[PDB]
Input
Amino acid sequence: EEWEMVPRHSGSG
Amino acid sequence: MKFQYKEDHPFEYRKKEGEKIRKKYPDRVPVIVEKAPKARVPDLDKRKYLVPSDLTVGQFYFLIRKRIHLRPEDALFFFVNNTIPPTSATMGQLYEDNHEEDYFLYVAYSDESVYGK
Output
């Protein structure tokens, strides 16, 4: 199956 | 560390894919994510993640928590080679130190702090 392209500099809390 | 992904896809094909995906996206690392044995946490349909090398373990917790719809009071732990990685580590550093011979990084997630309990 396909790779999920995770975005840069997202939240963390 | 037993991963169903490694049962499903023979090593020779994983290694070919890992080599190609590192050449195509050198600023990302390929990560296989699966539920730890006997964890009581929701399933994660998507197992394959191409993660920016600079993304932190803490940012990756935030992503996976959302994907599996955890309640605020639910806990989430990651395991790489039977150890909880530091929340402040980058995923590229985790990859450099823990990737397997197929060039993938394997991360298990759980509601327990001990892998496979």
